[PDB]
Design a protein around this ligand. Structure first.
Ligand SMILES: *[C@@H]1O[C@H](CO)[C@@H](O[C@@H]2O[C@H](CO)[C@@H](O)[C@H](O)[C@H]2NC(C)=O)[C@H](O)[C@H]1NC(C)=O
Ligand SMILES: *[C@@H]1O[C@H](CO)[C@@H](O[C@@H]2O[C@H](CO)[C@@H](O)[C@H](O)[C@H]2NC(C)=O)[C@H](O)[C@H]1NC(C)=O
Ligand SMILES: *[C@@H]1O[C@H](CO)[C@@H](O)[C@H](O)[C@H]1NC(C)=O
Ligand SMILES: *[C@@H]1O[C@H](CO)[C@@H](O)[C@H](O)[C@H]1NC(C)=O
Ligand SMILES: *[C@@H]1O[C@H](CO)[C@@H](O)[C@H](O)[C@H]1NC(C)=O
Ligand SMILES: *[C@@H]1O[C@H](CO)[C@@H](O)[C@H](O)[C@H]1NC(C)=O
Ligand SMILES: *[C@@H]1O[C@H](CO)[C@@H](O)[C@H](O)[C@H]1NC(C)=O
Ligand SMILES: *[C@@H]1O[C@H](CO)[C@@H](O)[C@H](O)[C@H]1NC(C)=O
Ligand SMILES: *[C@@H]1O[C@H](CO)[C@@H](O)[C@H](O)[C@H]1NC(C)=O
Lengths: 361, 120, 50, 254, 50, 49
């Protein structure tokens, strides 16, 4: 009170000095059920992968994507992102994801990169200089390789011009190594562009076949259907907590509600447009949001020339939520309630007055 | 509850103190207004139990003993006909004590004339 | 952005407190009139017309 | 497969009164015993709504401009109206949205379709005739859901294209009136929001033929257009919109 | 630019309305006094000095 | 008559409604003041000729 009045002596009276707050104790985040998962099992772990001149493009959209399972997997020998962060894939949202799957040699795994120049980069699969997304690659020597040699995986060796980014070329036109005319007829200086790989189990690390899946993100004006997973916590009721329900955040006491919502309605508002009712997204139940018990802290004292005894009034605060007496004005601590009636010395409110004789109310 | 907002609000100084002090002045002015209007007598007068006033009937303005609020029928009809940091402070005088003050004024002006307003 | 919200809400609160002070002055004038009528019509007989 | 229908009878389209229909819930917010004034794309009260018939020989399937929204009213018996055609140019050059309800389920597709000039379905007295498209080349969005569906049923629909979201509001109402729109109040609940993100400027209803040439089953439907205006909506104790005030209709409601 | 012009003109209009409310309160007090003089000096003879 | 100005002005809320309400209250208060001062009789008395 001396701090509030900017004086070392306090006259007899009641002085509003501070503002009692019920501090939030927990944080409750309730987010709806993580269903309709993206089909990453049929892209990363499919039956047969495609060649690199005819790489399979899978469109990931209208689903929720759990990149934490993909990132925490130890089978992947290469997980390199060029436009995003691996730890923020579960937080960001994208319109759609293009998954480009193919098989290359182990020494050509570095060639799927922006600014990298190679045969696979120029003739088989080209990335732009402003590429966003992540390239994932893992060894597949136990599956793709055959003791007689797996010749099913072809790759383009010759083309007149370099690729545009995200361009396919499945054409089988005979290349002209020299300047002799070739009408599709092979000769001394005219060769077929698609050659087969030499995947065998006796080769070392670098010649083993590597399966590569490249995820590319689009951030167009289409709505962001692809988002990360939502980790909803448990629900705590009857306490002043910080609630986060489907992006609607606030602070309040969450109690059971008798308001019966219609099934299309999610939140509830009073006359003054304040959210006082809400539906939990996990379990379809209705909760009232009572604001925490904020109050004004008033100090009831006589003069400091008389005595240093004080009483504290918490305005509009019940005595179970803070010589303790409950008034209609609030909870009064430090004053002894008496049954006698006197004239009002220090006004408390609602017919209650305080006086010094100790402090009585 | 945003702490960054309050840190930016401290740059504007004592605007909030002025608003709170003006509202506190209004709040104590309302209680002073009620005190000046109704508490004009320091003696709580009662009517006699026998209402023999020479044919004059005051039952519609005297308090009804059957009602728990101790209001007159006219006062009861009057009370029936009236229907984020925000707090409402209760008034210092409750409606029962304002009704008691009006009952004392009615008993004084019925039993004692204008003499109770100028002395005994 | 918070500064814009702060100055808007502060302007709203100053407007509210100003109109509350004006209405408090009006109610104080009405209550002074009511106390005058309590003193002169109830506690005595008044010669003042109307 | 496409078929020109050449046994139609020429007749100008009709018009009738909207009364107090076309109201929908503007948001997902419960409100209790309060009056809420809201600014949104609403259908004007007592407005001029376009009336189309299917009677025998009338078969009304034209293409109409979408504008900012479409109120679709359907006085329906025996399920003649089956879906709608959504797009801009209605050919393979652009990307179009398909809403169909056949005998099993509802299918929602966003693809590059080649629409016929006269698209319809057909029921043999059994549905065994599908002539609504000729091709489907590049699909971007597919969505299979639960089925939405004297005139006995009344079907109200509101379609909106706001920020790439396709809002479908609907309400089923049991009526027993013969010819025109009944007079009453019914707020349309939100059914499904679609992430389409496409331009739509024109629309077309999909009907079904009855075969036993072709015969048109008895049906009538109504097209209204949504305009940006203010409604004062009344919310009861249970939280349903029971009455509304159009703020720009007359000075009394103003 | 319109945000600067809007906040300047809104502050000017709020100042004008506040001054008009204070002057209207003063004129209301003067009119209550004039009605009291009409009741007590014209419609009757007043014992109140001056 | 600038519609962009009114679209930006709607972001500030109901300040204009408050000012119009205060001015309307002042405007009806002036008529109430004249009614209270001058209309203290319901009979229009006339002097003799
Ligand atoms: C004074 O007035 C009251 C009410 O105005 C009278 O009470 C009524 O008495 C009659 C018969 O005694 C009843 O039928 C009414 O119902 C009473 N009215 C009420 C409101 O209770 C009362 O009789 C009058 N006289 C005295 C001497 O008290
Ligand atoms: C149904 O009628 C329409 C309208 O005439 C036909 O559409 C035209 O078809 C001819 C056929 O070569 C084209 O040359 C025109 O350009 C088309 N008109 C338009 C506006 O596109 C349609 O082909 C007919 N259906 C069938 C199956 O013949
Ligand atoms: C195959 O890859 C997918 C990637 O989504 C993973 O979920 C699945 O567990 C893998 N299969 C096996 C047998 O580990
Ligand atoms: C969502 O998950 C909870 C988890 O217990 C389950 O009870 C509920 O049935 C699920 N579905 C819906 C629609 O809430
Ligand atoms: C509706 O429009 C048509 C022509 O567009 C017109 O003939 C008709 O009178 C209109 N209806 C009303 C009720 O004005
Ligand atoms: C949508 O289509 C219409 C006509 O088909 C055109 O005028 C309009 O510009 C298009 N909108 C966009 C954003 O391209
Ligand atoms: C309804 O349409 C879906 C999708 O085109 C199709 O799979 C289904 O077979 C159709 N139903 C009938 C009865 O043909
Ligand atoms: C759309 O389809 C045509 C023909 O099928 C094809 O040439 C074109 O590449 C496709 N475009 C896209 C974006 O899928
Ligand atoms: C609200 O619902 C109750 C049933 O819970 C019903 O008795 C009451 O009539 C309804 N009120 C309105 C206005 O529809």
């Amino acid at each position: 009170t001396k701090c509030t009045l900017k004086s070392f002596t306090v006259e007899k009276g009641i002085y509003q000095t501070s503002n009692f707050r019920v501090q939030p104790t927990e944080s409750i985040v309730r987010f709806p059920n993580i269903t309709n998962l993206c089909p990453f099992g049929e892209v990363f772990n499919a039956t047969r992968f495609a060649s690199v001149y005819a790489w399979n493009r899978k469109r990931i959209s209208n689903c929720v994507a759990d990149y934490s399972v993909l990132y925490n997997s130890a089978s992947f020998s290469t997980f390199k992102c060029y436009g995003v962060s691996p730890t923020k894939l579960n937080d960001l949202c994208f319109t759609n994801v293009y998954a480009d799957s193919f098989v290359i040699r182990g020494d050509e795994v570095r060639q799927i990169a922006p600014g990298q120049t190679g045969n696979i980069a120029d003739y088989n699969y080209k990335l732009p200089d402003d590429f966003t997304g992540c390239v994932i690659a893992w060894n597949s020597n136990n599956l793709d390789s055959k003791v007689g040699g797996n010749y099913n995986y072809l790759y383009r060796l010759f083309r007149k011009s370099n690729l545009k980014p995200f361009e396919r070329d499945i054409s089988t036109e005979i290349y002209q190594a020299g300047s002799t005319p070739c009408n599709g007829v092979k000769g001394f200086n005219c060769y077929f562009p698609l050659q087969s790989y030499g995947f065998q189990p006796t080769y070392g690390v670098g010649y083993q076949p590597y399966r590569v899946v490249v995820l590319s993100f689009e951030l167009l004006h289409a709505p962001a259907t692809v988002c990360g997973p939502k980790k909803s916590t448990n629900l705590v009721k009857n306490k002043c907590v910080n609630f986060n329900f489907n992006g609607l955040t606030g602070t309040g006491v969450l109690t059971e509600s008798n308001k019966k919502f219609l099934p299309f309605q999610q939140f509830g508002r009073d006359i003054a447009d304040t959210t006082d009712a809400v539906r939990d997204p996990q379990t379809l139940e209705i909760l009232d949001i009572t604001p925490c018990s904020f109050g004004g802290v008033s100090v009831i004292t006589p003069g400091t020339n008389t005595s240093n005894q004080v009483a504290v009034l918490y305005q509009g605060v019940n005595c179970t939520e803070v010589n303790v007496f409950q008034t209609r004005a609030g909870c009064l601590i430090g004053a002894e309630h008496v049954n006698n009636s006197y004239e009002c010395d220090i006004p408390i409110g609602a017919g209650i007055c305080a006086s010094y004789q100790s402090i009585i109310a | 509850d945003s702490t960054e907002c309050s840190n930016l609000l401290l740059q504007y100084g004592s605007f909030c103190t002025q608003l709170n002090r003006a509202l506190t002045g209004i709040a104590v002015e309302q209680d002073k207004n009620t005190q000046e209007v109704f508490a004009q007598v320091k003696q709580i007068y009662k009517t006699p139990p026998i209402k023999d006033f020479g044919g004059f009937n005051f039952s519609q303005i005297l308090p009804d003993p059957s009602k728990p609020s101790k209001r007159s029928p006219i006062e009861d009809l009057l009370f029936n006909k009236v229907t984020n940091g925000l707090t409402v402070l209760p008034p210092l005088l409750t409606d029962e004590m304002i009704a008691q003050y009006t009952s004392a004024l009615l008993a004084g002006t019925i039993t004692s004339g204008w003499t109770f307003g100028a002395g005994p | 952005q918070i500064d814009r919200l702060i100055t808007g809400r502060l302007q709203s609160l100053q407007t509210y407190v100003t109109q509350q002070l004006i209405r408090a002055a009006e109610i104080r004038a009405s209550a002074n009139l009511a106390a005058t009528k309590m003193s002169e019509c109830v506690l005595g007989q008044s010669k003042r017309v109307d | 497969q496409c078929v020109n229908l050449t046994t139609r009878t020429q007749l100008p389209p009709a018009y009738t009164n909207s009364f107090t229909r076309g109201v929908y819930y503007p948001d997902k917010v419960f409100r209790s015993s309060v009056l809420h004034s809201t600014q949104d794309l609403f259908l004007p009260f007592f407005s001029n709504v376009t009336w189309f018939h299917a009677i025998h020989k009338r078969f009304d399937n034209p293409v109409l401009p979408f504008n900012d929204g479409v109120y679709f009213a359907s006085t329906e018996k025996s399920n003649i109206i089956r879906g709608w055609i959504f797009g801009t140019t209605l050919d393979s050059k652009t990307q179009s949205l398909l809403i169909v309800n056949n005998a099993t389920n509802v299918v929602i597709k966003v693809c590059e379709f080649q629409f016929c000039n006269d698209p319809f379905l057909g029921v043999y007295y059994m549905e065994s005739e599908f002539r609504v498209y000729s091709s489907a080349n590049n699909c971007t969005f597919e969505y299979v859901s639960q089925p939405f569906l004297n005139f006995k049923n009344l079907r109200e629909f509101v379609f909106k294209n706001i920020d790439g979201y396709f809002k479908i509001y609907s309400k089923h109402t049991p009526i027993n009136l013969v010819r025109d729109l009944p007079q009453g109040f019914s707020a349309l609940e939100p059914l499904v929001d679609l992430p389409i993100g496409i331009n739509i400027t024109r629309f077309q209803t999909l009907l079904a033929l009855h075969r036993s040439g072709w015969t048109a089953g008895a049906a009538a439907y109504y097209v209204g257009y949504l305009q940006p205006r203010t409604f004062l909506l009344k919310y009861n104790e249970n939280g349903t919109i029971t009455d509304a005030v159009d703020c720009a209709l007359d000075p009394l409601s103003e």
